[PDB]
Design a protein around this motif. Sequence first.
Motif, mmCIF file in Angstrom:
data_model
loop_
_atom_site.group_PDB
_atom_site.id
_atom_site.type_symbol
_atom_site.label_atom_id
_atom_site.label_comp_id
_atom_site.label_asym_id
_atom_site.label_seq_id
_atom_site.Cartn_x
_atom_site.Cartn_y
_atom_site.Cartn_z
ATOM 1 N N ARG A 1 -15.060 -7.006 -10.703
ATOM 2 C CA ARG A 1 -14.125 -8.139 -11.484
ATOM 3 C C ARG A 1 -13.277 -6.832 -12.466
ATOM 4 N NH1 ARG A 1 -17.914 -9.147 -13.882
ATOM 5 N NH2 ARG A 1 -20.084 -8.723 -13.119
ATOM 6 N N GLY A 2 -13.516 -5.285 -12.799
ATOM 7 C CA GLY A 2 -12.904 -4.735 -14.169
ATOM 8 C C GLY A 2 -11.675 -4.641 -13.187
ATOM 9 N N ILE A 3 -11.440 -4.483 -11.719
ATOM 10 C CA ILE A 3 -10.164 -4.568 -11.386
ATOM 11 C C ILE A 3 -9.171 -5.623 -11.118
ATOM 12 C CG2 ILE A 3 -9.145 -4.503 -9.071
ATOM 13 C CD1 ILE A 3 -11.554 -2.474 -8.167
ATOM 14 N N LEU A 4 -9.530 -6.204 -10.809
ATOM 15 C CA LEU A 4 -9.406 -7.861 -11.339
ATOM 16 C C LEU A 4 -8.486 -8.333 -12.231
ATOM 17 C CD1 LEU A 4 -11.013 -9.740 -8.572
ATOM 18 C CD2 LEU A 4 -8.854 -8.495 -7.946
ATOM 19 N N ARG A 5 -9.558 -7.268 -13.916
ATOM 20 C CA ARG A 5 -9.210 -7.412 -15.055
ATOM 21 C C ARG A 5 -8.021 -6.774 -15.333
ATOM 22 N NH1 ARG A 5 -13.476 -6.574 -17.636
ATOM 23 N NH2 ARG A 5 -15.256 -6.371 -16.505
ATOM 24 N N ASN A 6 -8.283 -5.821 -14.677
ATOM 25 C CA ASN A 6 -7.459 -4.895 -15.326
ATOM 26 C C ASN A 6 -5.623 -5.122 -15.204
ATOM 27 O OD1 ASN A 6 -6.086 -1.857 -15.519
ATOM 28 N ND2 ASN A 6 -7.694 -1.369 -16.922
ATOM 29 N N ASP B 1 -4.429 -5.630 -5.636
ATOM 30 C CA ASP B 1 -3.817 -6.649 -4.733
ATOM 31 C C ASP B 1 -3.053 -6.310 -3.507
ATOM 32 O OD1 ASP B 1 -3.035 -9.461 -7.875
ATOM 33 O OD2 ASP B 1 -4.985 -8.753 -6.446
ATOM 34 N N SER B 2 -2.405 -5.703 -3.477
ATOM 35 C CA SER B 2 -0.706 -4.985 -2.191
ATOM 36 C C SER B 2 -1.846 -4.244 -1.442
ATOM 37 C CB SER B 2 -0.059 -4.185 -3.484
ATOM 38 O OG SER B 2 -0.792 -2.430 -2.804
ATOM 39 N N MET C 1 2.117 5.831 -6.497
ATOM 40 C CA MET C 1 2.173 6.005 -4.733
ATOM 41 C C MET C 1 1.751 5.432 -3.518
ATOM 42 S SD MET C 1 2.236 9.545 -4.867
ATOM 43 C CE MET C 1 3.133 10.730 -6.650
ATOM 44 N N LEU C 2 0.377 4.606 -3.983
ATOM 45 C CA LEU C 2 -0.214 3.544 -2.978
ATOM 46 C C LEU C 2 0.715 2.548 -3.215
ATOM 47 C CD1 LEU C 2 -3.512 4.597 -4.807
ATOM 48 C CD2 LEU C 2 -3.227 5.039 -2.440
ATOM 49 N N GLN C 3 0.420 1.945 -4.171
ATOM 50 C CA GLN C 3 1.543 0.485 -4.417
ATOM 51 C C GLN C 3 2.994 0.317 -3.402
ATOM 52 O OE1 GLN C 3 1.523 -1.419 -8.296
ATOM 53 N NE2 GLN C 3 2.785 -3.229 -6.827
ATOM 54 N N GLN C 4 3.542 1.337 -3.037
ATOM 55 C CA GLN C 4 4.672 1.754 -2.629
ATOM 56 C C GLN C 4 4.002 1.849 -1.335
ATOM 57 O OE1 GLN C 4 7.717 4.298 -4.225
ATOM 58 N NE2 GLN C 4 6.402 4.100 -6.568
ATOM 59 N N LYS C 5 3.211 1.968 -0.929
ATOM 60 C CA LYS C 5 2.419 2.582 0.308
ATOM 61 C C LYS C 5 3.013 3.966 0.895
ATOM 62 C CE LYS C 5 1.493 -2.445 1.912
ATOM 63 N NZ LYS C 5 -0.230 -2.738 1.128
ATOM 64 N N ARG C 6 2.966 4.964 -0.299
ATOM 65 C CA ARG C 6 3.403 6.479 0.531
ATOM 66 C C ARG C 6 1.997 6.902 0.101
ATOM 67 N NH1 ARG C 6 9.175 7.488 -1.307
ATOM 68 N NH2 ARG C 6 9.677 6.127 -1.839
ATOM 69 N N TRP C 7 1.600 6.950 1.446
ATOM 70 C CA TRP C 7 0.176 7.063 1.728
ATOM 71 C C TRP C 7 -0.053 8.491 2.001
ATOM 72 C CZ3 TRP C 7 -1.593 3.382 0.413
ATOM 73 C CH2 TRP C 7 -1.251 1.607 1.589
ATOM 74 N N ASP C 8 0.693 9.256 2.959
ATOM 75 C CA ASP C 8 1.171 11.135 2.452
ATOM 76 C C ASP C 8 0.768 11.630 1.365
ATOM 77 O OD1 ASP C 8 0.400 10.525 5.537
ATOM 78 O OD2 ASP C 8 0.752 12.923 5.771
ATOM 79 N N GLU C 9 1.922 10.767 0.520
ATOM 80 C CA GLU C 9 2.388 11.411 -0.795
ATOM 81 C C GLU C 9 0.929 11.355 -1.862
ATOM 82 O OE1 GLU C 9 4.352 9.412 1.196
ATOM 83 O OE2 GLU C 9 6.142 10.374 1.087
ATOM 84 N N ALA C 10 0.459 9.973 -1.873
ATOM 85 C CA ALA C 10 -0.419 9.694 -2.709
ATOM 86 C C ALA C 10 -1.600 11.368 -2.578
ATOM 87 C CB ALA C 10 -1.169 8.085 -2.454
ATOM 88 N N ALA C 11 -1.914 11.032 -1.147
ATOM 89 C CA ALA C 11 -3.116 11.824 -1.135
ATOM 90 C C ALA C 11 -3.087 12.866 -1.557
ATOM 91 C CB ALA C 11 -2.922 11.802 0.570
ATOM 92 N N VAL C 12 -1.768 13.616 -1.474
ATOM 93 C CA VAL C 12 -1.250 15.627 -1.860
ATOM 94 C C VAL C 12 -1.528 14.694 -3.055
ATOM 95 C CG1 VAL C 12 0.145 16.226 -2.596
ATOM 96 C CG2 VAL C 12 -0.063 15.659 0.054
ATOM 97 N N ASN C 13 -1.147 13.825 -4.128
ATOM 98 C CA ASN C 13 -1.589 13.600 -5.730
ATOM 99 C C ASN C 13 -2.617 13.488 -6.377
ATOM 100 O OD1 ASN C 13 -0.739 11.428 -8.262
ATOM 101 N ND2 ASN C 13 0.991 13.637 -8.221
ATOM 102 N N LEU C 14 -3.408 13.007 -5.095
ATOM 103 C CA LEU C 14 -4.829 12.554 -5.759
ATOM 104 C C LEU C 14 -5.362 13.976 -5.745
ATOM 105 C CD1 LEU C 14 -5.484 9.156 -3.738
ATOM 106 C CD2 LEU C 14 -5.799 9.569 -6.105
ATOM 107 N N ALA C 15 -4.960 14.945 -4.862
ATOM 108 C CA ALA C 15 -6.360 16.305 -4.446
ATOM 109 C C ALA C 15 -5.945 16.949 -5.987
ATOM 110 C CB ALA C 15 -5.904 16.893 -3.329
ATOM 111 N N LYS C 16 -4.800 16.556 -6.597
ATOM 112 C CA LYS C 16 -4.445 17.319 -7.934
ATOM 113 C C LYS C 16 -5.801 17.083 -9.026
ATOM 114 C CE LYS C 16 -0.173 18.690 -6.008
ATOM 115 N NZ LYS C 16 1.177 18.164 -5.907
#
Length: 164
Positions: free
Chosen positions: A76-81, A89-90, A120-135
């Motif tokens: 519910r929090g995600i859905l309201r944010n 949703d994507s 990045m996740l929205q854009q479905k750039r999986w690997d790039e997002a993986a690298v970003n989230l690790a920082k």
Amino acid sequence: MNIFEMLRIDEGLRLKIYKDTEGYYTIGIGHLLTKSPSLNAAKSELDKAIGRNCNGVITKDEAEKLFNQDVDAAVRGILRNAKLKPVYDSLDAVRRCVLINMVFQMGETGVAGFTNSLRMLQQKRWDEAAVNLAKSRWYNQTPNRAKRCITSFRTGTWDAYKNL
């Protein structure tokens, strides 16, 4: 695998108050009680949350009840944010689970903070997002959990948890 089993793997189950990785008072399946240093403050919160005098201890049933609430409240929090909703949703079913996990661990505001990664996740750039989230502090503080989540966003499968 579903969000409940996934969270249960990451958080574990404890029927007595305990200190989380950050040193805060928790109970059950990762239910934060208070960021307060006082065990008493924690026992108070606990009794308020359960509706009984628990004396720092709960039953499996009580734990699972808190768990059902927290997962519901995370969703519910995600859905309201406004920052989170469009990303959720994507996403496909597995990846949606991953965002709920993050939200459950770090609160809505915290995940909402990962601006570049969300994009990045929205854009479905999986690997790039993986690298970003690790920082992130998140990753350096609870690396095995963060890698599980990260692997999941990466592949869109439950492999990381099929081990466990």
